[PDB]
Design a protein around this ligand. Structure first.
Ligand SMILES: NC(=O)c1ccc[n+]([C@@H]2O[C@H](COP(=O)([O-])OP(=O)(O)OC[C@H]3O[C@@H](n4cnc5c(N)ncnc54)[C@H](OP(=O)(O)O)[C@@H]3O)[C@@H](O)[C@H]2O)c1
Ligand SMILES: NC(=O)c1ccc[n+]([C@@H]2O[C@H](COP(=O)([O-])OP(=O)(O)OC[C@H]3O[C@@H](n4cnc5c(N)ncnc54)[C@H](OP(=O)(O)O)[C@@H]3O)[C@@H](O)[C@H]2O)c1
Ligand SMILES: NC(=O)c1ccc[n+]([C@@H]2O[C@H](COP(=O)([O-])OP(=O)(O)OC[C@H]3O[C@@H](n4cnc5c(N)ncnc54)[C@H](OP(=O)(O)O)[C@@H]3O)[C@@H](O)[C@H]2O)c1
Ligand SMILES: NC(=O)c1ccc[n+]([C@@H]2O[C@H](COP(=O)([O-])OP(=O)(O)OC[C@H]3O[C@@H](n4cnc5c(N)ncnc54)[C@H](OP(=O)(O)O)[C@@H]3O)[C@@H](O)[C@H]2O)c1
Ligand SMILES: O=C1C[C@H](c2cccc(O)c2)Oc2ccc(O)cc21
Ligand SMILES: O=C1C[C@H](c2cccc(O)c2)Oc2ccc(O)cc21
Ligand SMILES: O=C1C[C@H](c2cccc(O)c2)Oc2ccc(O)cc21
Ligand SMILES: O=C1C[C@H](c2cccc(O)c2)Oc2ccc(O)cc21
Lengths: 248, 247, 248, 238
């Protein structure tokens, strides 16, 4: 009788915080991961010790290819195989790196458009076809319109994800599936980023001059899936401490 | 120890539901009203019966005039006089009626621009000057696809978007968050014939029904909560996908 | 036979460059002004030297008041008085100054909301009522969603002006009146501003690291009034060298 | 001397009107085509009869694949081969069809995202890499935020194209390359009746007019902007 959720890229960072929070709210969770096998199984162990048989892992490369549909179909099936249901999909996995206009370009396209947009489209297709408070939450980007220089493919992927969010909200509304987004500004900074670079970004945030915690992101996801957002579809909630309001 | 909130136009409909849910959440409330005295008083009595001394009413006309700043200062002051603190301001009161391009026009300007934008700005000023603090402005999900011949109403709601953004930016250093909730079709006019209500209800993708006032209130409750501590300058549509629907 | 245009705040700076370019294009012009009497008359003299009887001035305060509707009515009337028609309204006049949240406030409201929004609405009403290629161009602000801090009332007026542009495009389209906007980022900087602060802003602009000329702004106005924009209504053209794309 | 432009999907409809108008303004043009060879050539004949050796054709499939980057590089190369320069890129080519959520799906991806967004990105890269009034114009969609039901992949591609427009305007501004969009609405009678401005479709020429403005010296300060050419349609509530 407990609902079940899929969170993609859930081994670590924001995805983990979302799977933890959904699990604390009473969901059964599929922890999807790609390379972070040890971190995924560790998380699943932690959740299962809290309530047995409530977390499973599922490995998949979400790069675009001719087998991406089957991989997306398999992630959703994993939720139905473990739990008998799939109530919520959180499209959280993301590739993020520069692609200057001035890895083959075709691999960059597949990872950056694949993970950020095509895999959410296919997961959304599979989640809908395999079908109560059903919804999807896409992890978007509050700075989509003021993009980092030399990030065109990543920015294109996140814009396409805004498109998907709106299109799928429209199309799936008659089936009672809501589709919303959460758009972080700066949250957990890159592990490879030096402290001095971190602090440059921190200093730009009006609300408290610091990045969002992973939990702060997850809070907005939890709202969107809850009974308190039952009329909300096609909405993208920024969780950016005002960063997107700040001019150059 | 309990926080306090001001809700403008709180006697009826959406404002009432906001006031109720804030009260249920543990807030003391100033129920602002303009003409609906008997409804505002009945709400305050209902709330005070639940928890003594947790609701007061405050009457004020929020039409723009040279007395508006003093009116808006008095509303915020009443919250401090009643409760010793003011944690939350909800700018909900609104005039809404058509102003075709083809009451004097200056009265229309004072009502539609004053209630929807100037009074929120003056209230926001008074709230900040007197300081989990936050302001929620009731915006309009259809602001970019507006009702025909509603130009002043639409200008006031666009201005409120600007206020939401400008005040989030300027008040973030004081730890005051500023957000909006943007209904699509929520509670319909009482007099509107069912056949007309149904024309609008049928356009809504999610459930072919309008939002209840409580569903609008739920987004306000989220925004003022510890769960939105990092959210400022955001406007959450609560519209069942209505604004995504093309002509 | 020559069309006629009203330009508000046309004595100086951007509105003057609009008036000039409209006149160069074949229009007869009403040069509206408030305080810049010598500048206004001097402009009308220059245009009239070039084609006699093609320019008049019209004085008015565009601050909100109970007589504002009459003043806006009189501006439109002046165009019909001088030229027998009124084909184009350019809403260019603007008050701009800070109003920190933390002159009386009701004067600030009257000025910043009156000039930027109410006078445009009233001028639009008067234009439409007194009524080919008819159109209205509103001067907006490309930075409306990334506001200068402490400019709430200004930013509110300009957001209202976007609402007006869309509402009036919708309502006046059946009358053949197109309604569009032109949104400068940094163009001619304040007389009062120090050269160091001017260079700070110029440095932020991606395209050329400089402010827009007034003529670059006028060029977009000229497009939107022309026969090459006959299917364009409700659009706002940013003329800001990419400034609004730049993150904090 | 005379500037040169590449227009993708230039054989018919909006891209043809665009090539014609740029040619009338004094550009030399590369008329790109996929399937419409006879049309591309007929247009080329009409422009060269007007002014000899000012119009060439270029065949390429703009579907995403392992060979798309070569194809896009070759389109830009064709401009430089024929004309010695490439001043203007118009990304007009587009695939358009529904992809319900409830051709393999990955061929749909390749066409809807490849032609509408990835080709524009690779063409932008090639245009920029090969470089006094340089600009790119992307043909966007005025209804991007109020999409047709069951057109998710198309809509995703057009959103990605908005992102490309903004990212490339930012990144290429230092090179003096401006990057802007034109967003048509409708350019059958059911639709035309909804249009506030005279309840008719945009002609292709009205779309071309906005392109012509954006590439002109009257737009030398405009970058990152998307001009709706939709008769007000995007303003109309449901
Ligand atoms: N962090 C921020 O400040 C910020 C800012 C804006 C937007 N966002 C968005 O917020 C969400 C969460 O952010 P985040 O920093 O937590 O994400 P992240 O750490 O950058 O990535 C999350 C996970 O994505 C998975 N992933 C990457 N490439 C993949 C592929 N090819 N196939 C399958 N999975 C793949 C990875 O899983 P494995 O580790 O298992 O390989 C990674 O752990 C993302 O959608 C991101 O775009 C974040
Ligand atoms: N209902 C919808 O579908 C919908 C759609 C979009 C946006 N909204 C927005 O959501 C909010 C709540 O909507 P609603 O339908 O519940 O509001 P409403 O019933 O139209 O108005 C709310 C209250 O505003 C107060 N008010 C009106 N004119 C005033 C004035 N001159 N001075 C002081 N107070 C005044 C009135 O108080 P008294 O009764 O005490 O005189 C009224 O009861 C409003 O901001 C509205 O614009 C609603
Ligand atoms: N310059 C920029 O970078 C920039 C940036 C964003 C937006 N804009 C917008 O673009 C337009 C033109 O810019 P600008 O810098 O040329 O404007 P401006 O010089 O700041 O103002 C233009 C004129 O507005 C008139 N005006 C001001 N208060 C008035 C009142 N109460 N009644 C009647 N007229 C009044 C003044 O006329 P008198 O001189 O006759 O008193 C002034 O010369 C404006 O709408 C502005 O908001 C400009
Ligand atoms: N018409 C409208 O109302 C409207 C509305 C919104 C947006 N738009 C946008 O405006 C632009 C032009 O509109 P339109 O209606 O003229 O376009 P269209 O006729 O739908 O298509 C334009 C051209 O794109 C080319 N194309 C299609 N698939 C291709 C592929 N896989 N590889 C290479 N080329 C391919 C075709 O060239 P070949 O013929 O050579 O095969 C076609 O003639 C497009 O970007 C469109 O998305 C148009
Ligand atoms: O780790 C980051 C921070 C990074 C970031 C860094 C600095 C400023 C800013 O607005 C955003 O944004 C990301 C986007 C996608 C993603 O998967 C990870 C990140
Ligand atoms: O009663 C309404 C419904 C009305 C409405 C009616 C029909 C469709 C729609 O999008 C909105 O919107 C309002 C806006 C402000 C307000 O104070 C009240 C209302
Ligand atoms: O003089 C300016 C520049 C000024 C400005 C100054 C610095 C940055 C920026 O984006 C804009 O904006 C204005 C807005 C209205 C107006 O009437 C005049 C100005
Ligand atoms: O022919 C159309 C019309 C079609 C259309 C049809 C009806 C309503 C509407 O907003 C758009 O939009 C297109 C988008 C891409 C494209 O290549 C062609 C078209």
């Amino acid at each position: 009788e407990a609902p079940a959720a899929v969170v993609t890229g859930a081994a670590k960072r924001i995805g983990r915080a979302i799977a933890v929070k959904l699990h604390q709210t009473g969901y059964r969770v599929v922890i999807h991961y790609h390379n972070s096998a040890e971190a995924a199984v560790s998380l699943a162990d932690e959740l299962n010790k809290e309530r047995s048989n409530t977390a499973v892992v599922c490995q998949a490369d979400l790069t675009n290819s001719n087998v991406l549909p089957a991989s997306c179909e398999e992630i959703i099936n994993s939720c139905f195989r473990a739990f008998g249901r799939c109530d919520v999909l959180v499209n959280n996995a993301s590739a993020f790196y520069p692609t200057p206009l001035v890895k083959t370009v075709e691999t960059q396209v597949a990872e950056l458009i694949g993970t950020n947009a095509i895999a959410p489209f296919l997961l959304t297709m599979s989640f809908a076809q395999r079908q109560s408070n059903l919804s999807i939450v896409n992890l978007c980007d509050a700075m989509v319109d003021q993009p980092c220089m030399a990030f065109s493919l990543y920015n294109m992927g996140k814009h396409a994800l805004v498109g998907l969010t709106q299109s799928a909200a429209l199309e799936l509304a008659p089936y009672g599936i809501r589709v919303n987004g959460v758009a972080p500004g700066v949250s957990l900074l890159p592990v490879a980023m030096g402290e001095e670079e971190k602090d440059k970004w921190r200093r730009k945030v009006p609300l408290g001059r610091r990045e969002a915690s992973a939990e702060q992101i997850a809070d907005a996801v939890i709202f969107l899936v809850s009974g308190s957002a039952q009329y909300i579809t096609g909405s993208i909630i920024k969780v950016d401490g005002g960063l997107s309001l700040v001019h150059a």
